[PDB]
Ligand binder design. Sequence first.
Ligand code: HEM
Ligand SMILES: CC1N[C@@H](C)O[C@@H]1C
Length: 292
Amino acid sequence: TLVHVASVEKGRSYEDFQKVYNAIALKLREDDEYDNYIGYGPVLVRLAWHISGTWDKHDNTGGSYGGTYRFKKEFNDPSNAGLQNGFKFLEPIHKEFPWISSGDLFSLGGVTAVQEMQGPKIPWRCGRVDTPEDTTPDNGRLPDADKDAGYVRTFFQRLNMNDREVVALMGAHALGKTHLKNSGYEGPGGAANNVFTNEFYLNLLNEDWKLEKNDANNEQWDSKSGYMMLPTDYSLIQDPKYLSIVKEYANDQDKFFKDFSKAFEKLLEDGITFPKDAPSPFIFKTLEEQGL
Ligand code: HEM
Ligand SMILES: CC1N[C@@H](C)O[C@@H]1C
C-alpha cells in the first residue's frame, strides 16, 4: 500500500524554482575547485540518483519524495559515502531558499548539474514533501558494483527501468570519478569528466580494457589510457542486448541525450503521484541562456 501525492510548496511558481536552479548553477561555477577541479556537478547527479534509487515499486517505499536522505540512517548508508559533499554543497542553498522541500532540492541539484554540464534538458516537477524519520528506507537498496549483466537487469527491475533505460542512465558514469576511500574503486571513466557527453559508450567500445585487482582488492576494468570501468559498467558490453544499445548511444549523441532525459526524470519521479491539475513539468533555462 502507499501513496505519495505531489503537493506544490505554497505560493510557489516556475520563477521561484528558476531562482533555486540559478543559485545551484552559480555555486557550481563558483566552487570550481572541489575534487581536483572536477567541481560539484558529478556528485550532485549521483546524490539525485541515490536519493531516488531506494525506491521499490512493489510497496512504494523509498524514492525521492520524502527527502529521507537528511536522516542519519540513509545519510550514513555505506552506498552513500562521498555524498556528504553534495549535501554540504546544497546546505547554503537550502538556507537561501528554505521554503523548498528536501526531496525537491536534491533532485533539482541533479537536474541543474546535468544541464549546466552541457547535458540534455531534463523537465522537473516540484511537489515532493518531507516525511518523518521512520519513513527512511533501510540500507542495501542501491546496487553493488561487483556483479554482472544479470544482476544489473534484476536490480533496475525494482525501479521499473528496462534495458534501454538502464543503459541510458549508466552513461552518467561519463561524469566524475570513483574514489578508493568512498567505494573501494579508483580512477576516472574518460577525458571530459565534467561535461555531459556520450563518452562512456565510446570508451566502453574503443579503449583497450584489462581486468585488474585494485588497491582495495576489488576487481575493475582498466585501460592503457588510465580510464576505468566497474564490472557493472563493463557488463553493458558483455551482454548482447545491452551491447547493441551501447553502440547505438556511441553513434547517436542526440539519441542518448533524449533517452537519458526521459529516464532521468522517470528516475526522480518514481513513487510520486501527480494530481491531474499539478503544474506541468518545468524546463529551466541554464545560466548561459539567461546570459548570467
Ligand atoms: C549498477 C548501477 C550503478 C553502480 C554499481 C554505481 C556505482 C558507482 C560507484 C561505486 C561510484 C563511485 C563512488 C565513489 O567512489 O565516489 C559511482 C559514481 C558515480 N555514479 Fe554510479 N553507479 C550506478 C548507476 C548510476 C546511475 C544510474 C547514475 C545516474 C544516472 C550514476 C551516477 C554516478 C555519478 C555522476 C558518479 C561520480 C560521482 C563523483 O565523481 O563523485 N550511477 N557509481
Ligand atoms: C562509476 C564510474 N564508472 C566510470 C566510467 O566513471 C564513473 C565515476
